[PDB]
């Protein structure tokens, strides 16, 4: 161990996983899977490489490229590319490791990885970004490919970077293939990619509602509190309306908008907000209209949870730590029986404990049921996988076809979380299985067992 | 010819094929296809290679590996891997040759091959099998690939071996692709793979029943005699019940179970048998229950054919030579009008002659119609092909989607057998076309003509 | 061990080697090398492949192509190509196996293989041989290469065929490299290629003549007995005339010409014989002049040795089994102290054991010393490796350069044969070491030790 | 610049180089070469990869494998493999970085890299080392090759390991090429491989002895101080005896033997010491004879230098930091005018700056002249490149041939060290040029200029 470098962010993730596995009945029923945890925690392959490029001053520049290829038991390496000054190996092993098991949950054939550069997009011109992507991709293509490793976007790598990177791979490998996801519509991108994470959340909660109530209830006629104004929260809200539900809240960086009384946002309203966000206007400048007005109450500086009144479903999809303990109690007091994270890490540990304590203490549908983002988010990860599949046929499915497959993939997440908690975190008679604990063990056990099948360990 | 090695098992297969083609009108209408038979009978490629490995005594061990790549006119090389002490080239050319034309019948894009080792799985530990697969696959990967050659299981190569072999190919080729079939569900296997051969048999007989009766009849309300207790006979029986038919018999290594009177097995009963077979208990230990009892008659030491009484369909799916001449007469006397082999070579030549003589002598649906296993079995070969297709999209279809495609593939087998017999074995006015003769010429003519299109011969 | 096919010619070669070992002290000093014997006798890789080609009638034709890549511990596979109607895998394994150890003796880095086809060159036009070589090479290039496998001439493949084989390799691999040996001088060939073998026997026996009779009882004033009158025999004779020796005997397939007194053939005469063979004419050229009517006694349709009279070195370089026993004994009556095979398998077992018995009996330098073509023939094999080296160096060495290195490679053979046997035969009582036993187990041990250094066995 | 990890050993190497530059006149004459310094210090490519292997208990084991391919401006990556429990990326970068410039000095075409694993060879059976090397090489071959990256020995990897590594490369790449150096003689090894380093220091200092004291005050009648008694020390001593020198001192790890008067060790004695080391015995062989009781004073568990008495060349070739300062000063008391490192890092900083101060003070040929192992050690590295060349030439040169070219490669080191510093140090006042400063910035400038010719910077 005196060899081992200190990789704080990575070690943090390992520690959390090993703790989760240890607080279950897994290493009881299957003690040899500790060997699995040992072997999986070392990446299958790691590539680092010098990236030399020219700035607009015509000056030579040096940065460092990385592609952590962590696990490929369940499919080709899959995970994003981050261009950001803080990037290093320890950051990218953390993200890559995490990705192994979030990709496993979908029930798609996706391994895990993460790559990128310590290149800084700030203050860089469009042409500087091009010259970088070209230098970057020149070495990377040696190491990726459509049946090998399929990167994607992340911080600093938008559709702009994806396109430069694809066009340089094309030049080098003389090939047209699903080597990157998040591509343009003319060259191999997928429909539903915008609606994905938001539709996915609502499809996941739809299986939660089904299960908890034996098919008695659905989003039909339920009051939903959403937070967020952007891509995830817009389309979550649209789906909920389509399902006959009422969207009672939305929020932005500076306040919450609440439906007075019984009521809902309408699709035209959502569209109006959308338009404000593309302009970087605040969801206050719409209640300045006399439309909205007494239909809506705008609370500056505040989250929606205490002020929605009575609610049934809530969908935090704004940022991290956006549901405190107290706000978790409030949702419980309002009759909220389902919470799912559209935003990664939106609920604080305090709020999770609050929901997980209520779940244990109240049988069946009397409980509030909490679902972590790593299963509810997964929509975006899923349409990535559907983009790859569409690239293989060289076909573009209809929005209807991609929606349907996404619906299934989302049922797989619910099922992987539910079934794993029933086995390794078995609840007492009448208690809902923990979808959080389930969704944390589920990726590991799926990967590990397949690793065993394939002889990665024994 | 003084060069030619004696390959008995292979030469046997050639002799049988050339006899089948000669006893038709093919080399009359198309005499130049004798050139086809000459060229096809030499494999496109054959690889043999030393396999060195370490036993648990840490001792070096030597065996011989093979991959016969026989024909690829109609698709990538496809066929199984056998680990068995008797393996040699002559065995594997026999099986490989046969596979060319059984894969052709499906109407899928599958060439023909067969591979394996003279390695003996007996007395070998799990780790010894791993060390072998790793040594084996190390040389094999040079010669196979998802669009090149897709091996599969056979004697001595179960899901255990498939997984070791896949995991070693992964390591070597740095690729995730449909390079093997019969994979685990987490890493690229297919649903319906268990139900495949049994569902396939019933779908094939369903097209037989349709044809012979102009769509008047179906499995709706017909008494079916099945033999066998394992994978093929369980799911054949389930499908028959689903179709509204009555399963009146099942059998194991030591006796037959018969429905007294009018009656059928029920799905719960099938499941009960299934459970006895996984434990290696005998289908007698269920009539020891007072359930079953006077519903069933258990005949130790006996096959079901004479004792089912009157029957409509029979589905020998236990082992080889399980329907004698006399038993073939018995089925005929009981009104049996459709026989299809779930087991390879289940009917003796005596029984085939018996059915084929009745077919010639009795017009239309008065006949008994015999279908060889090489077309009725083909279910397993089909879901293999569907597994490959699913691996290409990196998608998992629903059990409903794989069932539907299997249904089609099974119609293709019926049609390739029917149509080829109408052309090259034309029956007299009012006689059903021979599905046995048809199914024997059909693979050859499909392959040969495509070979001609591609310039393999001229 | 019933699985294995019947391979006569190969099984014979293994038996003979396995009895040469164990009849030595190798397996007591190194018992674990029976493991080596077991592993090395399975070929590393074998390839068989259909060759379809068009005859001048426009007719499709089928033959079978092979390449036995037996062992590569000491370097790339190296071995020749035989086009002949008798070819099969058993014959090619025999030759390949033997090539492993024959190439080891040169002290070059050359593994052992052999390939060819059952294609019959007899009666074939030049265009048919072209068409075949294209078709043959199209599959073969997948399996060979400058650093992988370098084939070369043998029965059915002359410089004509080598050229057709090279061209097609060029067209397919877009390369140009030492992938074949025996190539034309304009395109990668070597000088001393024709002389090579003939020069090699003379160099070999020169070192035999040095070691026995250390005081340089050399080729200087020896009357040497040659048989053959082919390019092996003519360059063998030139070399011994250059060494101050006297050539007394050349022979034709039907034919045998003897120096009636003391004297020799001259280079000018050799030149005349060469011209006769370009005309496929028989010797019959003592008729040309009463001068050549003297110095020459001619014996049609028979054979040399007995009538040569008294002396000292014999070089059988005609064909296999130069009729033996008796003449061998006659050569001990004449003061024949040195016999080396210029033709492969030139001495029949009866002449071998006769020479090896005399060695046993008569102590050093009183004995006839027999050397196996496994060292004497190796001159050709040696300039092939030199043709490879020259192809690497992008250079075409002087005849002097390639002759010098040949002289050394020959001494290596002698040394590997002499030092081995002096170890593992240890002659005793001041007898000459067995160059037959030495030459055989030397190649084995060199390969087998290098096998163990790498992981091939343990 | 916080993103970057903490790499002690590497950061040290950069700092030391960056201070050697800038303390020279290079950056005034060529300021843009600070750009070179920035680019070259990022490695061109880095690969890390999990190695799973099986111990003799049948237990799965995990270690980590690396290959730092740092710079290839001047040729393929070349650098050794270290198996040791301390290995990590920081250590390997330090070594790789240093190898870049050490290889440049030979004037061969050799880029710089370094690799290995944290696998611990201690306590491992031969079979465990085999199993590891297979597993290690299986991933490594993807990244190396005769014209790409040629690794070689270092701490944990001897000729044993090289052989296991080569075999597995053979099996995987189906090639046979100069992909590893330090290979056995039967399979691609070089003569003068063992002598190499030892011969190289003597050749280097011979040119130091030529330049200072131009009138050939050569090894002729020098009493030379050696330390080490390993293969570096024994071939260093043989060479100086051949040069007419007198070896006065050899030492063991615990141990130090001195010629008590005028005289030397003999080759026969060296031979005896070598045998002792094959037995892991200590010197203790002046006991064998009162003869050796004279000519020899022995000092256990301590150290040479101070007690050698008066003279002239010292060759520390034992291990790192031969205890310094004091003895260094003693060597200036004896007429020691030449000190070159046969061991890497043999002189501690205190002895370096002591020697470099004396050089400053005493004008030419009155000074002790210190040479860094960065030139003196380079004999080994040089015959490795020669082993490569021989592998290319398909040839195995005479010991004379490889010695001659080694002698020249050594003169290149001296010349690159001498001519540089005489440029970028310019000693002044008729002082000897710093061979320490010269040797260091020479490698940099050679690489950096070739970097600029290609596009690596500008």
TrEMBL record, chains A, B, C, D:
InterPro entries: Aminoacid_DH-like_N_sf, Glu/Leu/Phe/Val/Trp_DH, Glu/Leu/Phe/Val/Trp_DH_C, Glu/Leu/Phe/Val/Trp_DH_dimer, Glu/Leu/Phe/Val_DH_AS, Glu_DH, Glu_Leu_Phe_Val_DH, NAD(P)-bd_dom_sf. The keyword Nucleotide-binding applies. SUPFAM superfamilies: Aminoacid dehydrogenase-like, N-terminal domain, NAD(P)-binding Rossmann-fold domains. One of its GO terms (biological process) is glutamate biosynthetic process. NADPH binds at residues 82, 84, 122, 154, 156, 193, 197, 229, 231-232, 253, 277, 282, 344. The active site is at 114 (proton donor). Succinate binds at residues 78, 80, 99, 102, 114, 193, 384. It catalyses: L-glutamate + NADP(+) + H2O = 2-oxoglutarate + NH4(+) + NADPH + H(+). Substrate binds at residues 78, 99, 102, 153, 384. One of its GO terms (molecular function) is glutamate dehydrogenase (NADP+) activity. Keywords: NAD, NADP, Nucleotide-binding, Oxidoreductase. The gene is gdhA. The lineage of its organism: Eukaryota, Fungi, Dikarya, Ascomycota, Pezizomycotina. Homohexamer. NAD(+) binds at residues 197, 231. It comes from Aspergillus terreus. The record marks 154 as: Important for catalysis. It holds the Pfam family ELFV_dehydrog_N. Belongs to the Glu/Leu/Phe/Val dehydrogenases family. GO terms for cellular component: cytosol. This is Glutamate dehydrogenase. Residues 190-455 form the Glutamate/phenylalanine/leucine/valine/L-tryptophan dehydrogenase C-terminal domain.
């Amino acid at each position: 161990m005196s060899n081992l470098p200190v990789e704080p962010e990575f070690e943090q993730a390992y520690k959390e996983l090993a703790s989760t596995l240890e607080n279950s009945t897994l290493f009881q029923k299957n003690p040899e899977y500790r060997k699995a945890l040992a072997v999986v925690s070392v990446p299958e392959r790691v590539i680092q490489f010098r990236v030399v490029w020219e700035n607009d001053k015509g000056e030579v520049q040096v940065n460092r490229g990385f592609r952590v290829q962590f696990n490929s038991a369940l499919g080709p390496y899959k995970g994003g590319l981050r261009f950001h000054p803080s990037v290093n190996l320890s950051i990218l092993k953390f993200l890559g490791f995490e990705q192994i098991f979030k990709n496993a949950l979908t029930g798609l054939n996706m391994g895990g990885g993460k790559g990128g550069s310590d290149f800084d997009p700030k203050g860089k011109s469009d042409s500087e970004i091009r010259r970088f992507c070209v230098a970057f991709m020149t070495e990377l293509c040696r190491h990726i490919g459509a049946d090998t490793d399929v990167p994607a976007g992340d911080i600093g790598v938008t559709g702009r970077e994806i396109g430069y990177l694809f066009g340089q791979y094309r030049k080098l490998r003389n090939s047209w293939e699903g080597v990157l996801t998040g591509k343009g519509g003319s060259w191999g991108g997928s429909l539903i990619r915008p609606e994905a994470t938001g539709y996915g959340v609502v499809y996941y909660v739809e299986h939660m509602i089904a299960h908890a109530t034996n098919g008695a209830e659905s989003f039909a006629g339920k009051r939903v509190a959403i937070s967020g104004s952007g891509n995830v929260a817009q389309y979550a809200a649209l789906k909920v309306i389509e399902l006959g539900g009422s969207v009672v809240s939305l929020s932005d960086s500076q306040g919450s908008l609440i439906v007075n009384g019984e009521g809902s946002f309408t699709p035209a309203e959502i569209d109006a907000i959308a338009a404000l966000k593309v302009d970087r206007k605040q969801i206050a400048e719409l209640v300045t209209d006399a439309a909205f007005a007494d239909k809506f109450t705008y609370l500056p500086g505040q989250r929606p949870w205490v002020h929605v009144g009575a609610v049934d479903v809530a969908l935090p999809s704004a940022t991290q730590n956006e549901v405190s303990g107290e706000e978790a109690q409030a949702l419980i007091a309002a009759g909220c029986k389902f919470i799912a994270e559209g935003s990664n890490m939106g609920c604080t540990q305090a709020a999770i404990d609050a929901f997980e304590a209520h779940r244990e203490a109240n049988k069946g549908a009397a409980a509030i049921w909490y679902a972590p983002g790593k299963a509810a988010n997964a929509g975006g990860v899923a349409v990535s996988g559907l983009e790859m599949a569409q690239n293989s046929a060289r076909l573009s499915w209809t929005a209807e076809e991609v929606d349907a497959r996404l619906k299934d993939i989302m049922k797989s997440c619910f099922q992987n979380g539910l079934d794993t908690a029933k086995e390794y975190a078995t609840p007492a008679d009448g208690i809902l299985p923990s979808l959080v604990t389930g969704s944390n063990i589920a990726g590991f056990t799926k990967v590990a067992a397949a690793m065993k099948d394939q002889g990665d360990w024994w």
